[PDB]
């Protein structure tokens, strides 16, 4: 309990801080001494301690300058230490700010020499920020160094230095090098993960030597471009606050022979005097790719030292190395053994909580308008990544600027501040901006998250048990099938008619687990037959076994009934391990072309047939559908679903479609000649009369055989 | 020993100590009894008694070659060696070699090989030696014609009359140029394969020899349910068991008193497990199995013809020799899918302890289309090379062109008789086989493999379900004979069925052990759930065949 809350203090003064004397109390402090109040991302400052007894117990009075300095708020939690160690300052340098200058010239330095540390003794820490009054301004100085060390106090006999230049402000901010786990959202379980993986190494040592065990020390994150992985290494790395050494592949990539390895050598060799430190790599596959496509020498001489330098790293020493790149397997399989690059984690598009987070972060400084919905964006943004919704923030600001440009003329050399006072982002801003974006990471297969519920399956009780009993119990009560020794199967096959309700079902199963859903339509497969495509069936269940548990699925998988990508397919999941919580759920409408391979048990065995909605599904689906669209009061579906009899899910949704199409068409003929924004009886009929089915009886019968002969 | 409790630790019977990982002699290693006999012949009678070749009269054998999958310890191996010799020992990357410019990998090479020589009770130790010298067929350019002529005349200009042995590691033995074969260089061949249950038991104990092991420990378990782990595999998922307790303590948190309460359980096992991934499995191996004779049920005139074939001739190969006969090596099982000429053949080799070898039908078709580890060659290489042993070739029929066919061809017959290596075949479409393959001299021998009956029934059923629990009194006789017509694959399906209906109902009770077995009515209602996966024309088309190779 000897942390402190924080306080906001009316008083301006800079070296002063009025705390209740049962806060000495509390630490047993004395008075006459300073103390050492510590915050947050290795941010600390020493303080003269005065006794207020206004100040209610525990309560402290801290000016507003210290707190900003300390890069803490109103309300904070702050440890507090005595000053055990107070000594004076003997030669101490600083340099004022040129923008805190501006409008009064002259060296004031002399000024305030004399009047703001007369016998003050105000202790003085590096990197600091006081303001002292000059004439008609105030103005703020920083503190560049000290001595003796580490902190010590303004003797009067303490010679004052000012010679240099003034140093800008927002310089240090846009530095990037103050950046802790606030400026990160959507990755708690990732964010985690890394700081287990490396704060334990660093911050407790001791906990793996008595355990007896070589801490880890290969750790790589990859994840799709632009996700924010050299964002979060920065943050973890400024968190743990241990040094710190940045290698970029293209930088080292970039010069010639030799000095590559120099470099490597240097910055491996200065991580080890430094200890504890982190070794950050960046795009690790352009140094060390797949070997396969590059035979050149000077990338195998390169790969080679790296491979020598992880080897000879010191048994015993506090220096954790971490790599990024976008493709898991396309970097050279070498360094993915024992003793190397083994922890892998992967980061996956956020989902709607991780870009409502994103967004908040990203716009804390631009000039919001009263009304924003940030809460709308998120749900209607799918597939961005952070950076996405950086540029998206940018035009949406572009756009401001463009509606506001034609009140000022461009050509002077100056805009009026009025102008600038009036700057606001609309929703319309953010509309529009949306509307010209480009999202590409869902171009590729990628880890997201889902969010469905049984309740969006409109039926299908029996298939729903069958599939929980399947799936929910060896992924939440191993312990039974250890101890009746059944294993559990994976590979499960829908098959029957399209648009029966099968992705959805996919995805609420991966919801009811808590998983990671995966998805790969059947082009992404013939493409990677054809290797047009990038990514291999390979990358795809390494990424799985990586963020597992998962649920793979791949829809039509008769659209490569080819036999290489079906041996590859076969070869993968037989080599999956069973214990692990993989998953397999595939789809096909035409269950006969599938090579009998695929059938085998240990494999896509278990079949199950997806019949068509009934009467109740049908009502339960429409209802489903229409949750954000007023209807006419008295609408009733009964009859439509009656008169749907044979209808797929696709159908009745193309159905409400056309229905508002309809009376969307009729609202805009009544304005231009809103009175009537809902759906009413017309449309409905006018919808069914345009009716039909996309399933011919034939193909029914067909499936109802099929079924029957799996059946018998 | 080592040429050197305070002096029995001074004479090995702050961190410099610790980090100088040596001194590692035999007892840090496991699991490859054989191997290390083969390796410790060929070092340490060359090395400590030259005398005894000379009186003998004949010039040792120096030129060593292991081979086996990544990270089975091959490294450790010869730093093991090298230091219970007591020799100096040293190592060269391939790549390292190959990384320096194009003369310094010759200057590296010729002083490290002068040094050595110099000062030469040691060994030379290669690494990576397939990428210092891969196939010459693929790779010709300038600095690969160079390095390995440079390697080839070092090798073959050694000095001889010194005690200088040169051992060389590659994870597959068909990958570097074929001229480092010949004599006077890497001749003396050894494989190095994923350790049977006793080997993994070994390694995890040589591991967990100082991590606080809870007090339930069951190392036997581990080593039963893990198969097909290499040594590094077994590291990690200590250190990953590790990991997880030190996880699960870290909620409650440095004080002392935790520390004192670090212990590793049976459940950081198994999600160590649960969060492990072997990579031995996807690429050919060697290994041992012990598949009991009396595991598998019928067939008896079966087992007797094959102990004939293969029991006899290499358990009294005199017999043999005195008439002439040469041992019988072609067999092909075939019959209905599902009978278990899987194990049959595991079996088989368990009788003669052959290392069993399996190439499935994924295998065979990336070979086929040149996607592929490795080919037909090397599966026939590390056959001979870990002799005896019994290759197992699956689906012969998945090969339906004809290159795979003419290489298994030219490898079958191109070995020698006397070499103990077995081929078993096994096909569900004997039709497709390749007539080629029927020849004399290759695999001629067919053995029909039927359905098995009643009593073959029951004892499959009992055997299966000896690790499971059962209601006390069950009969299953009448389960089996209510089970005519069915293969062993249908029983261990009704099997799993009553299984998973258990399991259910236990969970269901637990929500609401009540029944810790399975009763009958779980196998009623699993065998009214099953059916028979054979038709009846198959099997009417297996006695048509059977018939006419009668005929
Ligand atoms: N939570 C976040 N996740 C992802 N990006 C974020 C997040 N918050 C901010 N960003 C923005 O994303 C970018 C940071 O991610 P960055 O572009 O470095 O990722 P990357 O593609 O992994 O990087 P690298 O260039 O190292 O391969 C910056 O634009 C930052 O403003
Ligand atoms: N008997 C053993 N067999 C296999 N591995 C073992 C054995 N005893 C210990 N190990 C551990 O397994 C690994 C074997 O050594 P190492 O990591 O050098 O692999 P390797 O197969 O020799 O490597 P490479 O072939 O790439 O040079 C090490 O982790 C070692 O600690
Ligand atoms: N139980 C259900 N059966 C069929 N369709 C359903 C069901 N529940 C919802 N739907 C709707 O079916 C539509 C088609 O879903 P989709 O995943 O594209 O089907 P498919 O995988 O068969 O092509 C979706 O609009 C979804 O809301
Ligand atoms: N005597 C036996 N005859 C037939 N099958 C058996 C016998 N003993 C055990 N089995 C079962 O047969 C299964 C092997 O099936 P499979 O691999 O399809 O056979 P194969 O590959 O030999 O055609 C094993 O799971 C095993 O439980």
Same mark, same amino acid.
């Given at each position: 309990?000897?942390?402190?809350?924080?306080?906001?203090?009316?008083?301006?003064?800079?070296?002063?801080? @009025?705390?209740?004397?049962?806060?000495?109390?509390?630490?047993?402090?004395?008075?006459?001494?300073?103390?050492?109040?510590?915050?947050?991302?290795?941010?600390?400052?020493?303080?003269?301690?005065?006794?207020?007894?206004?100040?209610?117990?525990?309560?402290?009075?801290?000016?507003?300058?210290?707190?900003?300095?300390?890069?803490?708020?109103?309300?904070?939690?702050?440890?507090? +230490?005595?000053?055990?160690?107070?000594?004076?300052?003997?030669?101490?340098?600083?340099?004022?700010?040129?923008?805190?200058?501006?409008?009064?010239?002259?060296?004031?330095?002399?000024?305030?020499?004399?009047?703001?540390?007369?016998?003050?003794?105000?202790?003085?820490?590096?990197?600091?920020?006081?303001?002292?009054?000059?004439?008609?301004?105030?103005?703020?100085?920083?503190?560049?160094?000290?001595?003796?060390?580490?902190?010590?106090?303004?003797?009067?006999?303490?010679?004052? +230095?000012?010679?240099?230049?003034?140093?800008?402000?927002?310089?240090?901010?846009?530095?990037?090098?103050?950046?802790?786990?606030?400026?990160?959202?959507?990755?708690?379980?990732?964010?985690?993960?890394?700081?287990?993986?490396?704060?334990? =190494?660093?911050?407790?040592?001791?906990?793996?030597?008595?355990?007896?065990?070589?801490?880890?020390?290969?750790?790589?994150?990859?994840?799709?471009?632009?996700?924010? $992985?050299?964002?979060?290494?920065?943050?973890?790395?400024?968190?743990?606050?241990?040094?710190?050494?940045?290698?970029?592949? =293209?930088?080292?990539?970039?010069?010639?022979?030799?000095?590559?390895?120099?470099?490597?050598?240097?910055?491996?060799?200065?991580?080890?005097?430094?200890?504890?430190?982190?070794?950050?790599?960046?795009?690790?596959?352009?140094?060390?790719?797949?070997?396969?496509?590059?035979?050149?020498?000077?990338?195998?001489?390169?790969?080679?030292?790296?491979?020598?330098?992880?080897?000879?790293?010191?048994?015993?020493?506090?220096?954790?190395?971490?790599?990024?790149?976008?493709?898991?397997?396309?970097?050279?399989?070498?360094?993915?053994?024992?003793?190397?690059?083994?922890?892998?984690?992967?980061?996956?598009?956020?989902?709607?909580?991780?870009?409502?987070?994103?967004?908040?972060?990203?716009?804390?400084?631009?000039?919001?308008?009263?009304?924003?919905?940030?809460?709308?964006?998120?749900?209607?943004?799918?597939?961005?990544?952070?950076?996405?919704?950086?540029?998206?923030?940018?035009?949406?600001?572009?756009?401001?600027?463009?509606?506001?440009?034609?009140?000022?003329?461009?050509?002077?050399?100056?805009?009026? @501040?009025?102008?600038?006072?009036?700057?606001?982002?609309?929703?319309?801003?953010?509309?529009?901006?949306?509307?010209?974006?480009?999202?590409?990471?869902?171009?590729?297969?990628?880890?997201?998250?889902?969010?469905?519920?049984?309740?969006?399956?409109?039926?299908?009780?029996?298939?729903?048990?069958?599939? $929980?009993?399947?799936?929910?119990?060896?992924?939440?009560?191993?312990?039974?099938?250890? $101890?009746?020794?059944?294993?559990?199967?994976?590979?499960?096959?829908? /098959?029957?008619?399209?648009?029966?309700?099968?992705?959805?079902?996919?995805?609420?199963?991966?919801?009811?687990?808590?998983?990671?859903?995966?998805?790969?339509?059947?082009?992404?497969?013939?493409?990677?037959?054809?290797? !047009?495509?990038?990514?291999?069936?390979?990358?795809?269940?390494?990424?799985?076994?990586?963020?597992?548990?998962?649920?793979?699925?791949?829809?039509?998988?008769?659209?490569?009934?080819?036999?290489?990508?079906?041996?590859?397919?076969?070869?993968?999941?037989?080599?999956?391990?069973?214990?692990?919580?993989?998953?397999?759920?595939?789809?096909?409408?035409?269950?006969?072309?599938?090579? =009998?391979?695929?059938?085998?048990?240990?494999?896509?065995?278990?079949?199950?047939?997806?019949?068509?909605?009934?009467?109740?599904?049908?009502?339960?689906?429409?209802?489903?559908?229409?949750?954000?669209? =007023?209807? !006419?009061?008295?609408?009733?579906?009964?009859?439509?679903?009656?008169?749907?009899?044979?209808?797929?899910?696709?159908?009745?949704? /193309?159905?409400?479609?056309?229905?508002?199409?309809?009376?969307?068409?009729?609202?805009?003929?009544? +304005?231009?000649?809103?009175?009537?924004?809902?759906?009413?009886?017309?449309?409905?009929?006018? @919808?069914?009369?345009?009716?039909?089915?996309?399933?011919?009886?034939?193909?029914?019968?067909?499936?109802?055989?099929?079924?029957?002969?799996?059946?018998?």
């Amino acid at each position: 309990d000897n942390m402190l809350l924080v306080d906001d203090a009316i008083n301006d003064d800079n070296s002063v801080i @009025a705390i209740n004397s049962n806060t000495m109390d509390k630490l047993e402090l004395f008075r006459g001494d300073t103390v050492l109040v510590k915050g947050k991302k290795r941010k600390d400052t020493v303080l003269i301690v005065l006794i207020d007894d206004e100040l209610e117990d525990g309560a402290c009075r801290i000016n507003r300058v210290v707190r900003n300095n300390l890069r803490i708020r109103l309300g904070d939690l702050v440890t507090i +230490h005595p000053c055990p160690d107070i000594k004076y300052a003997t030669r101490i340098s600083v340099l004022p700010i040129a923008d805190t200058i501006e409008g009064i010239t002259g060296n004031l330095f002399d000024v305030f020499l004399k009047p703001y540390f007369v016998e003050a003794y105000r202790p003085v820490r590096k990197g600091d920020h006081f303001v002292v009054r000059g004439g008609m301004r105030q103005v703020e100085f920083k503190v560049v160094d000290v001595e003796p060390e580490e902190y010590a106090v303004v003797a009067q006999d303490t010679i004052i +230095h000012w010679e240099g230049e003034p140093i800008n402000r927002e310089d240090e901010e846009n530095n990037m090098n103050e950046v802790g786990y606030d400026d990160i959202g959507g990755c708690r379980k990732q964010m985690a993960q890394i700081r287990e993986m490396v704060e334990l =190494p660093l911050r407790h040592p001791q906990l793996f030597k008595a355990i007896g065990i070589k801490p880890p020390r290969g750790v790589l994150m990859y994840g799709p471009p632009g996700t924010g $992985k050299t964002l979060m290494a920065r943050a973890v790395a400024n968190e743990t606050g241990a040094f710190f050494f940045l290698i970029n592949g =293209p930088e080292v990539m970039s010069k010639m022979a030799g000095e590559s390895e120099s470099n490597l050598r240097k910055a491996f060799e200065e991580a080890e005097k430094n200890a504890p430190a982190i070794i950050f790599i960046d795009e690790i596959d352009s140094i060390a790719p797949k070997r396969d496509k590059t035979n050149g020498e000077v990338e195998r001489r390169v790969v080679s030292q790296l491979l020598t330098l992880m080897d000879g790293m010191k048994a015993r020493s506090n220096v954790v190395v971490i790599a990024a790149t976008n493709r898991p397997n396309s970097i050279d399989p070498a360094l993915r053994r024992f003793g190397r690059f083994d922890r892998e984690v992967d980061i996956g598009i956020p989902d709607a909580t991780g870009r409502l987070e994103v967004l908040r972060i990203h716009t804390k400084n631009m000039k919001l308008a009263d009304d924003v919905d940030l809460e709308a964006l998120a749900a209607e943004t799918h597939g961005y990544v952070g950076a996405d919704i950086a540029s998206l923030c940018s035009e949406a600001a572009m756009q401001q600027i463009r509606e506001k440009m034609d009140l000022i003329d461009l050509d002077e050399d100056e805009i009026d @501040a009025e102008v600038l006072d009036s700057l606001g982002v609309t929703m319309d801003n953010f509309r529009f901006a949306l509307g010209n974006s480009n999202p590409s990471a869902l171009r590729e297969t990628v880890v997201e998250s889902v969010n469905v519920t049984w309740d969006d399956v409109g039926g299908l009780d029996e298939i729903k048990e069958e599939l $929980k009993e399947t799936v929910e119990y060896p992924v939440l009560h191993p312990d039974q099938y250890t $101890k009746f020794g059944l294993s559990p199967s994976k590979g499960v096959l829908f /098959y029957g008619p399209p648009g029966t309700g099968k992705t959805l079902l996919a995805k609420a199963v991966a919801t009811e687990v808590s998983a990671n859903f995966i998805s790969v339509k059947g082009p992404e497969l013939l493409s990677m037959w054809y290797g !047009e495509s990038e990514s291999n069936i390979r990358d795809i269940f390494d990424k799985a076994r990586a963020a597992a548990p998962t649920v793979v699925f791949l829809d039509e998988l008769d659209s490569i009934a080819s036999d290489r990508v079906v041996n590859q397919l076969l070869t993968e999941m037989d080599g999956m391990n069973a214990k692990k919580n993989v998953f397999v759920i595939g789809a096909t409408n035409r269950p006969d072309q599938i090579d =009998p391979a695929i059938l085998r048990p240990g494999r896509l065995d278990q079949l199950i047939y997806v019949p068509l909605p009934d009467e109740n599904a049908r009502l339960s689906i429409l209802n489903a559908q229409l949750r954000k669209t =007023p209807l !006419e009061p008295g609408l009733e579906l009964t009859a439509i679903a009656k008169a749907t009899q044979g209808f797929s899910g696709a159908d009745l949704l /193309y159905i409400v479609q056309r229905a508002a199409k309809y009376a969307i068409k009729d609202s805009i003929e009544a +304005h231009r000649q809103d009175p009537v924004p809902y759906i009413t009886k017309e449309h409905f009929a006018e @919808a069914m009369k345009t009716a039909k089915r996309s399933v011919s009886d034939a193909e029914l019968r067909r499936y109802e055989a099929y079924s029957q002969q799996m059946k018998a």
